[PDB]
Write a protein that binds this DNA or RNA. Structure first.
Length: 59
RNA sequence: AGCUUUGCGCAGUGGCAGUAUCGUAGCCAAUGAGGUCUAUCCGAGGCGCGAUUUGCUAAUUGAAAACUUCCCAAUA
């Protein structure tokens, strides 16, 4: 062979840059494959949870 | 006029809630249900059947857990 040690690193990230849990990554993949995203209520709940997490991690 | 009682309903605090809270259309019941104490005495329901409204919020699962056209590229 040519001779090298390829650093094959595979990670799941989002548009916000945060690393995603495997369940979250699978949910994103399924939402993109099915062509339909989550509903308005689910999106609002996720946004509120993200805001709460950001507030908690700030202190 | 001030004050107070019983009963009742509204409102409120606090408390209880499966030996608790009710329906009972079934039956019996002050013309006496049920009594081991106090029995020539007490005085209320008892026994079977069948139950334990509404709103909000959160979380989990799932691709989607339900409110009215969405997406892609570029400039402003």
């Amino acid at each position: 062979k040519d001779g090298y040690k390829p650093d094959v690193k595979i990670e799941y990230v989002d548009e916000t840059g945060r690393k995603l849990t495997p369940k979250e990554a699978f949910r994103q993949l399924s939402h993109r494959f099915h062509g339909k995203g989550s509903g308005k209520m689910k999106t609002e709940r996720r946004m509120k949870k993200l805001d709460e997490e950001a507030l908690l991690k700030k202190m």
